Amino acid sequence: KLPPGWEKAMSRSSGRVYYFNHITNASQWERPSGEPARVRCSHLLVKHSQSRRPSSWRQEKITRTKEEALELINGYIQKIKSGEEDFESLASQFSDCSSAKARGDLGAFSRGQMQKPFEDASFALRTGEMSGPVFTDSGIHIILRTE
Numbered sequence: 001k002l003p004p005g006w007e008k009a010m011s012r013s014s015g016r017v018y019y020f021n022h023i024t025n026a027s028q029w030e031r032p033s034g035e036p037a038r039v040r041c042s043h044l045l046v047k048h049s050q051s052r053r054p055s056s057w058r059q060e061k062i063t064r065t066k067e068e069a070l071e072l073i074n075g076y077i078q079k080i081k082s083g084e085e086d087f088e089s090l091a092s093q094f095s096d097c098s099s100a101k102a103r104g105d106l107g108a109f110s111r112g113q114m115q116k117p118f119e120d121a122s123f124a125l126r127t128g129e130m131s132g133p134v135f136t137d138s139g140i141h142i143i144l145r146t147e
């Protein structure tokens with residue numbers, strides 16, 4: 001029936017069925033469509049006070065809470081999905097990762113190199129698809145699979 005990773009869910013505010021992926025935290029209205037040695041991803045990282053290194057090019061001392069970081073991530077996802085903003089533009093401006101200078105691009109990678117909730121979400125995304133909030137010891141990520 002459903003591809004692995006996906007489940008049916010019910011909207012609380014409309015009652016309409018939707019689909020949720022518990023590996024990528026993606027959610028969508030349509031029934032999902034459905035592994036390679038390597039994938040290529042970009043990401044937008046929002047750090048918080050419990051990040052492994054709570055500092056970034058944006059801020060010497062990152063002091064926001066994980067709850068505040070998630071609210072920021074959720075707001076960026078809204079703007080990307082509505083088309084008000086582009087993923088690459090938000091990553092260049094607001095990602096707490098050094099990859100901000102490359103529009104969030106991390107290049108290609110294999111299994112065994114990234115933190116593993118990042119890796120699992122990356123390889124579960126289809127080409128062009130974007131994750132929901134993904135949690136690692138670095139912070140909270142939005143992941144875009146580009147290849």
Ligand SMILES: NC(=O)c1c(F)cccc1F
Binds near residue numbers: 025132133
């Ligand atoms: N976007 C979110 O914060 C989220 C949620 F509200 C429920 C499940 C998974 C999620 F990533």
Ligand SMILES: NC(=O)c1c(F)cccc1F
Binds near residue numbers: 098101102105106
């Ligand atoms: N792909 C990357 O990891 C990267 C880059 F291409 C340029 C600057 C910083 C980075 F982390």
